[PDB]
Every structure is written in structure tokens, then in C-alpha cells.
Ligand binder design. Structure first.
Ligand SMILES: NC(=O)c1ccc[n+]([C@@H]2O[C@H](COP(=O)([O-])OP(=O)(O)OC[C@H]3O[C@@H](n4cnc5c(N)ncnc54)[C@H](OP(=O)(O)O)[C@@H]3O)[C@@H](O)[C@H]2O)c1
Ligand SMILES: NC(=O)c1ccc[n+]([C@@H]2O[C@H](COP(=O)([O-])OP(=O)(O)OC[C@H]3O[C@@H](n4cnc5c(N)ncnc54)[C@H](OP(=O)(O)O)[C@@H]3O)[C@@H](O)[C@H]2O)c1
Ligand SMILES: [Mg+2]
Ligand SMILES: [Mg+2]
Lengths: 758, 758
């Protein structure tokens, strides 16, 4: 399992230990700032906090900061490895808190494992945190410890999964009963494996208006019903049905309606599902192996409402569904705790979303969302731009309804505006591209097949099933390099090799190249020499003929050495007379794209307009709404240089061609990126918020800005340089492109070849 | 005290609460990265940690992370305000940990104030932190609590000041005994006010090889000596001298040699100092009021060795002296605790530094270091580029000598290299400029005297005593704007006003302007109209005549509208035929300067060489070693455009003019900023490390890059645009310049006017 075991063992800790880096969000680059932070000047915020404790969440963390406080006794799915020893998956849980909702997580881990001193230590560390994210407290001391801890602090004491997925689970129940046009009054339930996140879930499920006598709790030891054991089990006898001689699970169905269970191995069978009433609602939430094998049961019976917790299938129950967003409702409302109305109004938001999901800048191409409410869609997919702006305000609204909050939110229009603004700056458009490429792999030429980076990328693409690689190079050198690198790919089995020499199609290749380039300075002998010594020409001829769907070159040599071949063979797209390369950056303002960093040295107004339109179309296909800003050293007519006049001409041309495109210019970079500066300068600007597409006057400015920002102000690699305006799918990369860049660009080329590769 | 009370009450929390922002130091902008951080992929680091606890500091925080763990019982100098209520000055102490040494600080605050349960909670939270920074534990439970806590954890349990300043204090003692050519064997001591950081200091002071009988401990209740109280005070009777009838402090001197004391109000007098032996060594460390009033005692007796803890005078004892750097020695060595050899070898480093301080890129101009070892120099100044690379390796070396560490450092050449690399990226060149301007204020014209920003900057400059402002505007409008803004400045009292109309020197001003511009298109009537409607012309004529020393314009209008006036009046500098504007950025690689962002639209090779030389000279004057890199879209001859050829010509010209300047090009921005890319491309490059001066081919590229980086990748404002090549000190700013920018630029102009303002 080294393709996952070793790959995950290769953990991103190498630059600086720990995914979290406690760092100043404020400037600390001047003695004034340092004195404001540790010298007289920092005594004032502390004194103001001491005067009235109302200022605790304001001047410090503890506003956005949760602490996933743990004794390391059930580390996600690991168990009792320890507080300090739990740090890997501790940080793994804490990193999908900031990543998806911007939750600060102090990964402080309580070393006290006793079920009564652990609470003492946690309550001791209460003032550090504005809401604890109690996780890895194991069963049965999870319920005991959480019950003890809820009653002490005056700040949101919200456990993990124990409170947890009940919101997602009960939302899924509310939607599933909607699917089969049933009612909560008469629904019957079957629960198996009363574990940490299982036995506490029906308690919420009851809160919807559910009678206790309809729930049948079970564990490893048969069925937990009143009459089975002389000593009635706590928190389970309320639901416990009268004794009726039902000792086996295969008969206790009697036409039930729900299978809410968060446990381990399988307990349900196909005949068990058959004994269920009409329209079964199996909800097997087991992560290792689904308790019903959904394909088998669906072949046994149709119209299934099977719900799981794995992302391979729709209706996935992750923590990111509401946990970061619960605290985005819990901490951002000022609550002193989380009630059951908190836990139930957020049920009415994510359940509402599944049958009220639409628009939200669907990826015009790529992605392949194809999400409609029904038997295969009960709750939204794990990651959603409004999984926040619907669930977090639900929790806050429940906070004010419960009257337990200390900082009630004002008019929700402003709250929704800020939440959506935060939404724009965090997008993961590459995951839909990977998903869409995986369901229809195409043949991609990699002309630099002997490169170590290209070989690693080939291994990754074979593993993820994104493409059918076609390497170009000497098979001997490729094989020895593969063996030395340690890869598990083989010729023919995983990737096709095209030998640059002794190619059986040599005659038909150089002939086509000559017929393309006979009147462009290439003789027949030069064509023959190019189809043996220029792998880019071989790949381009392969793609043009039809033996491959896309090409990914550029990892060797200069950009234009490959782009000239690409343009000569494929040509320009229909209705397009220019090409441009778009580079993506993850700035603090969000995903930003810089247009024509590589192709045109000094584009003119018409070329700039074409590049702007192509960049907007490409960014639209990513699922991001294009917000273009033409950049210059002049701010809205400040200078009369030919460059600024060219930018204004391009703006007019773009407005002519695409009246619906949000674009403005020419302006400065800060005016484009921050809205306050632009509003001060141009209050009537057609550009709203931060611009995500930056069109530059010349290639020098674009390249210098991108190179400086990538090493200074950038998080990770997504795509770039995305070549636009060529007839066939091909992306010329750079010699310093990483393996991740190559894999992402190959996936993008595969998805573009799924859309008429011409 | 509102100029400090309100100003410090205006705390930098407005954008995001809390100086610390627990944020991913790793990219989290892709589903791959999110799964690596919270999904299967983060289970691997945690499992590897659990397998062997040796991986705790490696995959997470707890390597660089201290937690200043507190019950909020003595918050720096505040007291027992509370754990959560101590958050302001808690974060103030935690912010001068990351700011000066890059120490992560989890500001977790223990709510348990009992002297025996506090330790229980702290030991419970031990696995979260790789070394605790116990602070705000009050006396006498500070000593008790620290003594209890030292013996439990197997990770560095290093208290604050209690262990603390002993390193700096005993280093100061070691240097002071060097100053007066005495020996530790026969030195006598007087201690007053045995407080939290006082009674624990002589314990280290003994460890140098000091006899216990030479120390005389005292408190508020007279003198703590053996025979005074029937019950002998603990930790003080070892030093306690035999009873001799000495009941008053004014006589217990008998020619002593040290006054080590960390207490409150004054106890020592002038006749007390006279009773001291030859060459007194008073070391009054009281922060509110010095215990001796050093000027008065120095007038009473010469050759004083007075040492205080305030930064207004040399030999300041701050936490930044060694505390962040102790943990930079403690945590970065893998120790399980801090011994007394840790606490004593770091005494031999900072004490060594004071008499071994030299070079280290002294600010060629500005700054005014003027630091020589002697009676007024015992220990280095609070902030020093090698206060780290000498003290932290001292603590690590003491760790290996004590044999208590778990990750001993390899060959110290690599350690010193990394430490110096970290040193380059954190510089505070503006503090020396502020210090040098304050000791010689000059007259600075502010032609836009009616601007709210300029008025705020004028208030700041009057308060700090950096300049003698000369505002230009209507006195009526200026006064009403001052009253509305709430400032406490008055005309004549604090700043001079020059009325643009009805100026008594109108005739002599427009006459000089006409004589300058008579053959440049300006008539006598146009000169008269300019000296009434153009404040920049008035300020420039003022500076040229000699009635003012510097000008700071540009807060209104276009840059070149002011630069044309500046160039026409003052002209170019001697031997200089071009001007350029340098803008400063605080990048992750350090302070970076971009050359000619405002003046020359398309400079040629000679202009580029002149701009490069002027920028290097200016950066040298800041105290930073210039590392220039000429930027282009071509990487070392990749492209043959006229721009890249011009950059290469400029490189050759610069190498001719300044053979000692470290410069290379032309290259890409990433090649300039990160050394790995450059070494891959040009292994023999003359540029080492990251380039701090970036010279751009044209003004469009420079301006776009600076504008994008300032809003994306930048911490704070220092200076910019710094105008170079004009005869007299003047800086044209931008209309969006903040008050801090104006104050910094005025201070820079003041310091430049101290250096022959012509
Ligand atoms: N959101 C998610 O996707 C998510 C979140 C959390 C957990 N989970 C899944 O839930 C399970 C454990 O999570 P947890 O920590 O909440 O619970 P847990 O504390 O691990 O307990 C699991 C329970 O399952 C029962 N069990 C074990 N083997 C069984 C068998 N052969 N037949 C019947 N019952 C059996 C045990 O009950 P007895 O003590 O009576 O044996 C045990 O208490 C794992 O499968 C995990 O992947 C999924
Ligand atoms: N690095 C620095 O610059 C630095 C660091 C820490 C502290 N300090 C200074 O040290 C002082 C307190 O710091 P701390 O927390 O370490 O100590 P602390 O716990 O505040 O105790 C101060 C001690 O001074 C004594 N005292 C008070 N008034 C006195 C008087 N009139 N005459 C004689 N003794 C008197 C008291 O002793 P009794 O209990 O016997 O009255 C008290 O225990 C402040 O002045 C503070 O600024 C400076
Ligand atoms: Mg967990
Ligand atoms: Mg303190």
C-alpha cells in the first residue's frame, strides 16, 4: 500500500514542523509594532480586558480560536495512542478547520487520561479558548467526560462527533423522510453498534418530534431492549421496546424505516433489507466497510436511500460539513454553550441545502456536478461554497432563538455579505477537475518521458487514473530511470512508450510535419531530423493525427521553443488570432490569474482583448466568476503613455465583445486587489470586490509580478501556465515545474480533451 | 497621558482579533493538501509519533513552540488580573517572541490560581508544548510553583524572569567586574527589595564562583541577615552575615561592590554611594524610577557603572536580550530542562558581546551607533543581529556540556549559517533612523498642511520630537481641522505655519522661482501665481533658500506634478544625472527594495546603472548589505529583447563603477529571491542568498510588482518612495500614504538633512 502508505508517510513537514504556525497576523517589522505587541502598548488591551471580561474575544484569539482539546484516547479513528503521540492526526483534524472555514486550532493535548482529572485540566485551560472542540475522548468516557464538561465553562463547550455528526445525520434523516414522502411520527429505526458517535445520535434524532418507543438500540451483544438484561442499560431503556422473544437481529426489522448507525463491521444483510418496509432507508455510516455493500443491496432492491460517510459516493458526512461551520456559528455568535436548538436548526440548513442546491457558478466545463435531489442525493457533498453561509447562520440564529449568546449578530445582510466574501477567497476548483478527468481518462503525450519529474507525475497519474500516459523517449533509459527512482509503473501495462528513434510510424510522421512546414523553412531532411531529435514535434504530430488527445511539454528547454512547434502544428482556435498563457496564484484575496505571462511580449489592444476574453472564459470554466482588472502604472487615466492608452482601448474592445463580463481599468495592482482603494478612487467602478484576473500591459511586467508573488505571496500550486487560443489541448510548462504542477496540468488537459479537443 | 494612553489604547486588533493568528504555514488550497492535513494522510505523522515519541518536535509545533503558560498573577508588571483577563499583556509578551526570534507562542492561560493545582494543570498541558515559558506566576508562589514544576516534565521547563534576567544580570556583572579590573572573589553586594525577579538573581550570581558570605540580602523590612529575625528566612540565610548592629541600610555599605536589585522604588542615596568603595558598580534595575537617578549620582561621583533595565540608556535588560534566544538555545537543542550551565554559558555570550561588538553592517549614515565598551557600555543594546547567533548557540553548547539534550546540534558551522540566514530576513533599520533623527531635529516643510493625515503625522512628529514641522496652508482651515481632529498641537508652540497667501516673503519667493524658471516657460505672473497656489513650489523655495532643511510632499496630486517642481528647483545631485524612487517591502525573504517605481518610465543602461548605485548606497545607509538583482522576463540571456540587453549593459556598467557591490542579472524574480533556483540556474552567481534590491526594466513592471506585493505579500510600512538623485532632501509621497508612512519618511528626511542637505 506504499502508493498510499509511503505517499502519506511523505508528510508536508519538511520546510517547517507542524501544519499550524503560530504567527503574527499583524505586522511586526518595526520597533513601533514590537513595542505595541510586547512593550507598554500591549498593557492597554490586557488592562481593558481585565476591566470588563467582555473584551476577551475581541483583542485576542478565543474569538475564532477553538482548541481541539484531547487526551488522545480516540484519535479520529486511531484510538488511545496518547496526547502528545496523537499529534499527527490531531494536526490533521485541526488543519481541516482553518482550511475550510478559517478556524484557529491550538492543538493543546491534555496528558491527563483519567475521566475525572481530564475535565479538571480542560476547565483549567478554559480561559485560553473561546470554545473547546473536545475530540479523541474515547468511549464510554467520551459521554461521561462531555457531560461533566458541558456544565462548567461559560463558553461554547461543544464536543466532537459525540455532539458532532448528529447535525448532519438528523439533517439526512429530515431529507430522507422527505424523499419517501413519510413522516417522523410513524418511522421505525434500527441502530447497531452503539459506539462513541452512534449511541448519542438518536438522542438528537428524537428531538425532531420523534417518539422514543420507535427506536431500537443494539450493540455487539444482540439487541438492547427492555427485558433483555435484568439491569437496564442507561440512555437506552427509554427507547427499549417490550420483550417479545426477538433475540436475533435478522427478525427485529419487522418493516422498520431507518438504520442510523455509526459503528464498525457489517451487521445488516440483504434478506434483512427485504424484511424492511416499503422504501427502505438504510443509513450505513461505517467508514472502513459499508454495512450493506450499497451496490449489492441496490441490485437486490431498487429505490434505496443508502447513506454513507465516505466521499466516494454522494451524501457524505464529514466534519467539514458543519463542525468548522458550527463553531463559525457557535464562536461567531458569542454563545456560552451549544444547546439542542443549535444542534437542530443547523439540521434545517444542510437538509434544506440538498433540495435547494443550484447555480453558485457551476463550472461551465470541467467539474461535471450533475447534482439533483433524489434517492441518490440526501445531503450536500462534503465541500460547498454555501455549506458555510447556510449552516453557520443557522447555528447563530438558533443561538439567538435559545437566548444563550453574548454577541448577537446584527442584521444578517452584513453577516451574509462577509461570509460570502470569505467564500470567494477560498476555492478548490482543482478537485472537480480531478473528479471529471478520472471518470474519462484520455491519452496524453509527455514528450519529456525520461525526466524524473515527468516519471513521478506519470506514476501519480496512473495511480489516480487521471490519464493514459504516452511517454516519448528511449525505452532503455526510461526503464533504468524508473527502476532507480523506485516507481511501480511498467511499459505497456500502465503507460505507452513511443521511441523517438526506430518509431514504426516515422515515415508517416515526418511526412505530415513536412507537409505542414514545407513552405515555412523546413525541408524533408529537416523534417526527418525533427521527428527523431525533437520530442515536442513527435507529440504534436501524434495529437494532430489523433493517436493522442493532449500534450504536456515544456519541462525542458525554452517556452517558445515548444510553443512555436505547438502553434505551427495545431494553429490557432477558430475565431481566435492570438494565444496567451495564464498563471494561477493563491493570494490572500483568493485565486488570482495573471494573463499572458509567456506568449506575447508586447500585445496590442486587440490581442489584449482576445487574451482577456479567453482568460475570462477559462476562469469561468474553473467555476470561478471572472472579475477582470487591466493593470497599468496609471490609475484611471493618470498617465498618457501608449501602454495605458492600449489598456483603455482593450477595455473598450472587451466591453464591446462581452457586455456581461465584470471588468474595469486601467488601474493599479492595489486598486484591483483591495476594494477600499478602488472605491476611494472610482466609486462607480464596474469591478466588485477583488479582481481574480489580472491582465498586464507587457510580458515583462506579468512575468516579474508572477515570479515575485509566487515565491513571496502564494500558498500552493494549482495550474499554470494555462495555454489559451491553440486549436488542440496542449500546455507548455516550465523546466522548474514540480510533479504536482505536471499532474494538475495533465488533469486539466485531459478534461479539456473531453470537450472536443479541437 | 492620552498621547500614550489613547495611542496605546488604539491597539492593532481591528483587522483580525489577536496578534497571533494560528494559520497553516503549509499550503491548504487544494483537496490534496486538505486530505494530507485532516484526512487519511495526516494519520501517518500521528502514527509515526506514537510509534516512537522521538518525532514529537519534528512533525508538529512543540519544536519552536513555547507556551507562556500563566495564571495571570503577575502579568509582566501588572499583577493578578487573571488568566483570561491577562490576555492583552499576555499577547504583548508573546509577540516579542516571534517578532525577534520567531518563537511560536500559544497564549494558553491556566485559570487555576492555587499554588498546587496550577502545577497540576500545567503538567496536564505539558505534551502540547516543547518548553513552557512560565510567566505571570506571582511571588512568593512563583518560586514555589517553578520549583515544583521543574521536576515533572521531561521537556525544557524554563520559567520567565525568575530564571530570566539572571543570564543578562550575571553577564552584566561579569562585564562590570571586567570594567573596574576587579575579581569575583572579593566583591561585596547589596540587594534591596527581594521580589519575584530579585531574590532569585544572586543565586545565579553566586554560580560564577562567588562566595555566599559576600551577599547581603534586604527587603522592605530592613536587612535580611542572620541574627535579625529569630526565624531565619529561607534561601537568604546562606548569604546572611553575622549580627553586627547594622540596622539601617545607609551604613551596611561599608565599601560594597555591587547593587544587584530588581525591585520597586528607590532605596539608595548619594551618601550611600559615597560610602561605597572605589569604583562603585550600582546596578539599579527598577523600571518605573531608577533607584539612584543616574544623572544625579554621576554628578556626585564619576566613573559610575550604573546599569538599568530601561532602553532610554545603554545596557538595557529586556527579555528579547536572551529569553527568545534562550529557547532558541533550549528548544532548538532538544534539552529536557534548563540547568544552571544553560543559565551560565549564556552569561558568557552576551557579556562577551559587549566588549566584542564590531562591524555587522553599521549604518553608513543614519543610526549613530557609537558603541564602545566602557563605563557606559556593559551589555549589548536590547536589539542586535547577533544577540541571537551568540546567545542561542551558547545555550545549546551549555546543553551538550550538561548532557541533558535529546537532539544535539551537529557541526556549528551549519547552525551559525542558518541562524545568520534567519538574521538577514528580520531587520529593523527604522529604529536607528528614529533615534538619530530625535537627537537632532530639523525643519521639514509639509506643503499639504491642511490634510488630516499630514496633521496626524505632525502630531506624531511633535510628540516623538523627530522634526520641527513647517506646515503650509490657510491658518484658519488648519486650526479648525486640528480642533475637529482632536489633536493637541498649536501654531508656533509646536509647528510653524506658512500661509500660502499673504506670506511676508512672497516678493522674495516668486522672484527666486522666476529666476530659476524664467527660461523654462514660467513668466513673472506665473511665478507669482505659483507661489500662492502651488504649496510644493513654496516648500521647495523655502528649502532651497535655507529656511527649511527638508520637504515631504506628494500626499495630493500626481507624483510627477511634485517631482517636476523638485527637480526644477533643487536639480540633480553632483555626479548624478538621473533620479529614482525606491520602495521598501517586508517580504518573507526580508526587507526588499524596488528601484525606480515612480520617476523614469523607461530608463536606459546608464540610468539603470545610476539608479542601481544610488539604491545600493541608500540601502547601505540603512544598515543592510546591498544584494542587487536586475530583473527581467529572461533568465540569464534567455531572451534577446532590447530590455534584457539593456539590463545586461546596466550590469556591466555597475560592475565597472562598483566592483565591491554584490549584484547579478538579469534573472527572474524567483531566481533573485530564492537561492536554490539561482544555484540550479547559475551555480557561480555573484549574488548570495536573497536579493534585497530589485531593479526593474521599466516603471510599469516595477510599479505593478510593488503594488501587487504590497497588498498581497507584505507585513508593514517602513519607507517609500525614497527619492534618490536630487540635490536637497525631499521625498514625494503618494496620495494614499498613511500617517505611519509620512512619519517614517519625515524622519528619514530629517536624518538625511543631518548629512549635508545638498
Ligand atoms: N464521520 C465519520 O465518517 C466517522 C466518524 C467517527 C467514526 N466513524 C466510524 O465509526 C467507527 C468507530 O467510531 P467511534 O470512535 O465513534 O466508535 P468506537 O468508540 O470505536 O466504538 C465502536 C463500537 O463498535 C462496536 N463493535 C466493534 N466490533 C463490533 C462487531 N463485530 N459487531 C458489532 N459491534 C461491534 C463496539 O461496541 P462494544 O463496545 O459493545 O463491542 C464499539 O463500542 C469506525 O468504523 C469509524 O470509522 C466514522
Ligand atoms: N526586565 C525588567 O525590566 C523587569 C522585569 C520584571 C520586573 N521589573 C521591575 O521589578 C518590580 C517588580 O517586579 P517583580 O514582579 O519581579 O516583583 P514583585 O513581585 O512586584 O515584588 C516587588 C517587591 O518589591 C518590594 N517593595 C515594594 N515596595 C517597596 C518599598 N517601598 N521598599 C522596599 N521594597 C519594596 C516588595 O517586597 P515586600 O513583599 O517585602 O514588600 C515586593 O515583594 C517593578 O519595579 C518592575 O518594573 C523589571
Ligand atoms: Mg476524531
Ligand atoms: Mg511578565
Amino acid at each position: 500500500d506504499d502508493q498510499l502508505k509511503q505517499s502519506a508517510l511523505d508528510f508536508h513537514e519538511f520546510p517547517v514542523p507542524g501544519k499550524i504556525q503560530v504567527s503574527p497576523t499583524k505586522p511586526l517589522a518595526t520597533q513601533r509594532d514590537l513595542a505595541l505587541a510586547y512593550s507598554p502598548g500591549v498593557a492597554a488591551p490586557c488592562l481593558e480586558i481585565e476591566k470588563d471580561p467582555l473584551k476577551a474575544y475581541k483583542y485576542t484569539a478565543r474569538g475564532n480560536l477553538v482548541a481541539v482539546i484531547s487526551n488522545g484516547t480516540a484519535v479520529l479513528g486511531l484510538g488511545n495512542i496518547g496526547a502528545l503521540a496523537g499529534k499527527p492526526v490531531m494536526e490533521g483534524k485541526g488543519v481541516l478547520f482553518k482550511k475550510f472555514a478559517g478556524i484557529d486550532v491550538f492543538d493543546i493535548e491534555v496528558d491527563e487520561l483519567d475521566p475525572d482529572k481530564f475535565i479538571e485540566v480542560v476547565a483549567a485551560l478554559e480561559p485560553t479558548f473561546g470554545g473547546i472542540n473536545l475530540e479523541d475522548i474515547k468511549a464510554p468516557e467520551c459521554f461521561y467526560i462531555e457531560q461533566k464538561l458541558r456544565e462548567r465553562m461559560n463558553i461554547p463547550v461543544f464536543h466532537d462527533d459525540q455532539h458532532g455528526t448528529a447535525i448532519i445525520s438528523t439533517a439526512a434523516i429530515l431529507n430522507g423522510l422527505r424523499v419517501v414522502e413519510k413522516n417522523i411520527s410513524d418511522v421505525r429505526m434500527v441502530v447497531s453498534g452503539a459506539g462513541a458517535a452512534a449511541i448519542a445520535c438518536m438522542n438528537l434524532l428524537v428531538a425532531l418530534g420523534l417518539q422514543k418507543h420507535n427506536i431500537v438500540v443494539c450493540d455487539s451483544k444482540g439487541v438492547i431492549y427492555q427485558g433483555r438484561e435484568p439491569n437496564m442499560a442507561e440512555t437506552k431503556a427509554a427507547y427499549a421496546v417490550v420483550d417479545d422473544g426477538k433475540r436475533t437481529l435478522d427478525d427485529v426489522i419487522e418493516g422498520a424505516d431507518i438504520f442510523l448507525g455509526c459503528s464498525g463491521p457489517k451487521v445488516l444483510t440483504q434478506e434483512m433489507v427485504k424484511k424492511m418496509a416499503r422504501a427502505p432507508m438504510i443509513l450505513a455510516l461505517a467508514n472502513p466497510e459499508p454495512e450493506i455493500l450499497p451496490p449489492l443491496a441496490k441490485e437486490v432492491r431498487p429505490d434505496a436511500i443508502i447513506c454513507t460517510g465516505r466521499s466516494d459516493y454522494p451524501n457524505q458526512v464529514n466534519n467539514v460539513l458543519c463542525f468548522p461551520f458550527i463553531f463559525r456559528g457557535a464562536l461567531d455568535v458569542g454563545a456560552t454553550a451549544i444547546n439542542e436548538e443549535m444542534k437542530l436548526a443547523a439540521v434545517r440548513a444542510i437538509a434544506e441545502l440538498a433540495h435547494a442546491e443550484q447555480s453558485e457558478v457551476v463550472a461551465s466545463a470541467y467539474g461535471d456536478q450533475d447534482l439533483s435531489f433524489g434517492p441518490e442525493y440526501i445531503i450536500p457533498k462534503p465541500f460547498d461554497p454555501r455549506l458555510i453561509v447556510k449552516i453557520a447562520p443557522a447555528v447563530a440564529k438558533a443561538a439567538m432563538e435559545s437566548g444563550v449568546a453574548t454577541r448577537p449578530i446584527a442584521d444578517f445582510d452584513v453577516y451574509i455579505d462577509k461570509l460570502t466574501e470569505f467564500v470567494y477567497k477560498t476555492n478548490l476548483f482543482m478537485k472537480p477537475i480531478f473528479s471529471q478527468a478520472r471518470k474519462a481518462p484520455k491519452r496524453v503525450v509527455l514528450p519529456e518521458g525520461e525526466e524524473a519529474r515527468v516519471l513521478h507525475a506519470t506514476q501519480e497519474l496512473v495511480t489516480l487514473g487521471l490519464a493514459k500516459p504516452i511517454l516519448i523517449g528511449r525505452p532503455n533509459v526510461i526503464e533504468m530511470r524508473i527502476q532507480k527512482l523506485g516507481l511501480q509503473i511498467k511499459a505497456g501495462v500502465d503507460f505507452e512508450i513511443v521511441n523517438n528513434e526506430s518509431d514504426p510510424r516515422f515515415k508517416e510522421y515526418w511526412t505530415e510535419y513536412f507537409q505542414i512546414m514545407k513552405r515555412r523553412g523546413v525541408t524533408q531532411e529537416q523534417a526527418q531530423r525533427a521527428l527523431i531529435s525533437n520530442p515536442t514535434v513527435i507529440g504534436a504530430i501524434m495529437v494532430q493525427r489523433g493517436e493522442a488527445d493532449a500534450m504536456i511539454c515544456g519541462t525542458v528547454g525554452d517556452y517558445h521553443e515548444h510553443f512555436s512547434v505547438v502553434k505551427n502544428v495545431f494553429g490557432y482556435r477558430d475565431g481566435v488570432h492570438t494565444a496567451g498563457a495564464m498563471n494561477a496564484l493563491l493570494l490572500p484575496s483568493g485565486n488570482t490569474f495573471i494573463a499572458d505571462t509567456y506568449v506575447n511580449d508586447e500585445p496590442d489592444a486587440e490581442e489584449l482583448a482576445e487574451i482577456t476574453l479567453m482568460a475570462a472564459e477559462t476562469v469561468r470554466r474553473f467555476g470561478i466568476e471572472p472579475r477582470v482588472a487591466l493593470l497599468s502604472h496609471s490609475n484611471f487615466g493618470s498617465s498618457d503613455c501608449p501602454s495605458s492608452s492600449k489598456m483603455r482601448q482593450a477595455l473598450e474592445l472587451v466591453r464591446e465583445r462581452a457586455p456581461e463580463l465584470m471588468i474595469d481599468g486601467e488601474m493599479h495592482g492595489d486598486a484591483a486587489l483591495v476594494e477600499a482603494i478602488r472605491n476611494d478612487r472610482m466609486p462607480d467602478s464596474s469591478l466588485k470586490g477583488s479582481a481574480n484576473i489580472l491582465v498586464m500591459p507587457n510580458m515583462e511586467a506579468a512575468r516579474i509580478s508572477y515570479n515575485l508573488l509566487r515565491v513571496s505571496s502564494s500558498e500552493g500550486v494549482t495550474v499554470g501556465p494555462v495555454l489559451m487560443g491553440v486549436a488542440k489541448p496542449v500546455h507548455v510548462l516550465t523546466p522548474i515545474a514540480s510533479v504536482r504542477r505536471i499532474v494538475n496540468m495533465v488533469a486539466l488537459a485531459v478534461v479539456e480533451a473531453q470537450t472536443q479537443p479541437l
